[PDB]
Amino acid sequence: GLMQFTLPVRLCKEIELFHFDIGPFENMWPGIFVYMVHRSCGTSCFELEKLCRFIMSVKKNYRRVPYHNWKHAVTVAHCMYAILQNNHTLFTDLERKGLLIACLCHDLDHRGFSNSYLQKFDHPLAALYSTSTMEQHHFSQTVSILQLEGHNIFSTLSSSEYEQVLEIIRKAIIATDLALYFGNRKQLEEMYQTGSLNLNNQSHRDRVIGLMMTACDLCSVTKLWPVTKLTANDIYAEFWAEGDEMKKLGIQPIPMMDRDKKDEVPQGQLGFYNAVAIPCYTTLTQILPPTEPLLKACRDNLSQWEKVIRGEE
Numbered sequence: 001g002l003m004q005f006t007l008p009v010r011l012c013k014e015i016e017l018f019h020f021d022i023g024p025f026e027n028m029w030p031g032i033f034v035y036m037v038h039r040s041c042g043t044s045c046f047e048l049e050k051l052c053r054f055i056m057s058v059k060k061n062y063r064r065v066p067y068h069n070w071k072h073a074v075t076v077a078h079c080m081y082a083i084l085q086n087n088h089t090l091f092t093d094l095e096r097k098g099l100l101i102a103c104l105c106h107d108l109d110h111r112g113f114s115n116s117y118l119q120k121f122d123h124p125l126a127a128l129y130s131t132s133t134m135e136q137h138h139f140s141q142t143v144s145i146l147q148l149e150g151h152n153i154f155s156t157l158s159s160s161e162y163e164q165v166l167e168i169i170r171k172a173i174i175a176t177d178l179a180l181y182f183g184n185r186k187q188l189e190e191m192y193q194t195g196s197l198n199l200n201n202q203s204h205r206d207r208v209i210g211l212m213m214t215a216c217d218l219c220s221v222t223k224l225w226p227v228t229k230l231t232a233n234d235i236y237a238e239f240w241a242e243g244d245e246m247k248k249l250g251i252q253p254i255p256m257m258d259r260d261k262k263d264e265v266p267q268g269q270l271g272f273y274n275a276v277a278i279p280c281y282t283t284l285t286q287i288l289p290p291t292e293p294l295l296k297a298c299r300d301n302l303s304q305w306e307k308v309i310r311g312e313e
Ligand SMILES: COc1cccc2[nH]c3c(=O)[nH]cnc3c12
Pocket: 218, 220, 221, 232, 235, 256, 268, 269, 272
């Protein structure tokens, strides 16, 4: 109980900021995650032997892919940390526990291919779950790791609290399916704007947690330009492999995913910021005002992409 984790002074200060980068040192990421659970949750929330054994099984089960890797998991968990810390009293003891584990686990066993590629490939997972294919797999992998002897970090919860936390985690993970984000944000837009948004309404909470998950998942667009720019190389490395694999299935990929049409990337990112990112953190900022820095950074990076197209870098 008396064992805290601490960070070097630069990290200790930077980590509180939305635009924090977790750095190139893999071996320091679990300590960053544990630091965040303790500060976000309590030193009491989890038994450290169990949490450390969970984290290391979770790491082992992320693959060595260009973007959808262990570093993405820990980056997405840090954004959820930032949101929860700037919105202290809005979330339950349980929700804070659940949402940081859901973020760490949200892309478990990702191979770097869209749901769409699974369906055109006719992958067994597409027969097992017809929509949110990878997302239903990620949640399945989370429950598998939780069921490993010595890895049940929720052991000390009541029977009912346990079922609530796995339902928070199941909804959280499913909501990282971007095909579901469009409808979800539109319904949140209308509810906030007609003024019927009610945080005591569970069905409403779920919608708002889902937006947060999208917000955390896309948080590469909210970093300082040098980090956003270099992450975009990792993101596009996956898109180009997928487009190659579409070509092997006798299907010309959308020009975004095609590694012959790299010229089209900057306009690809405009559309993505204009149709996805800005709307996402706009709505997020209207429901949770203390998340405004994410909107501001996303606008800054949209501006940086405009400058790329205008041949100014
Ligand atoms: C995965 O989300 C992202 C995070 C950052 C930059 C991104 N660009 C695109 C894109 O062009 N299409 C779909 N997703 C993205 C994306």
